[PDB]
Amino acid sequence: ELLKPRTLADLIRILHELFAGDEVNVEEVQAVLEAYESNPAEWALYAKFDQYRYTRNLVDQGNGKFNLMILCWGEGHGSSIHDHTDSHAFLKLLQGNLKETLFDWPDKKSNEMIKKSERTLRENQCAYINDSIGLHRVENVSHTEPAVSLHLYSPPFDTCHAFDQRTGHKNKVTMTFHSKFGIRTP
Numbered sequence: 001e002l003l004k005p006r007t008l009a010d011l012i013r014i015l016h017e018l019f020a021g022d023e024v025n026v027e028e029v030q031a032v033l034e035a036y037e038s039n040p041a042e043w044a045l046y047a048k049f050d051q052y053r054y055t056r057n058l059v060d061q062g063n064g065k066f067n068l069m070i071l072c073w074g075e076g077h078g079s080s081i082h083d084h085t086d087s088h089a090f091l092k093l094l095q096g097n098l099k100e101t102l103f104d105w106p107d108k109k110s111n112e113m114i115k116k117s118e119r120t121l122r123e124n125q126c127a128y129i130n131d132s133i134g135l136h137r138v139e140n141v142s143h144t145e146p147a148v149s150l151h152l153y154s155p156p157f158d159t160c161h162a163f164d165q166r167t168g169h170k171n172k173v174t175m176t177f178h179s180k181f182g183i184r185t186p
């Protein structure tokens with residue numbers, strides 16, 4: 001029974017209930033993420049930016065079932081084209097706008113990865129992806145506004161692949177946390 005999360009803390013409690021089992025009701029998880037109205041005071045602790053690239057800030061470890069984290073995107077910061085390691089990936093905007101570009105899985109043959117579609121994700125919107133859907137790139141193309149997003153991955157993963165847009169070739173990447181539970185983790 002899904003109720004509106006009143007606060008980020010409330011959201012986290014609700015997520016623990018929704019991931020208490022072995023499976024994931026994606027539509028319910030997306031609905032509750034969308035229903036949380038971003039309150040910057042509640043996540044300022046996690047919103048640690050870097051001048052040169054986007055940062056990943058761990059918020060909750062989900063009792064082992066998921067990682068919940070906040071990503072902070074300076075102006076012009078963006079991601080690789082990447083997958084999600086056979087996991088569920090939810091993305092909710094907390095501040096600003098991000099451009100999500102969708103790509104298909106490349107064929108064995110070397111070829112330009114042509115974008116399938118793109119959308120602008122706006123404050124409080126929640127997107128979902130998984131490997132059966134495809135790949136994506138996420139970018140803050142703003143020249144004037146930093147962006148902040150809330151990501152939920154289930155099961156947790158700390159490795160993924162980056163794809164070369166020119167060829168489709170992939171390379172394994174290990175993701176690091178800029179901070180955990182509000183604490184910078186150099």
Ligand SMILES: N[C@@H](CCS)C(=O)O
Nearest residue numbers: 056079089138151175
């Ligand atoms: N999965 C990426 C961000 C876009 S979903 C990450 O954690 O760096």
Ligand SMILES: [Fe+3]
Nearest residue numbers: 082089136138
């Ligand atoms: Fe992603």
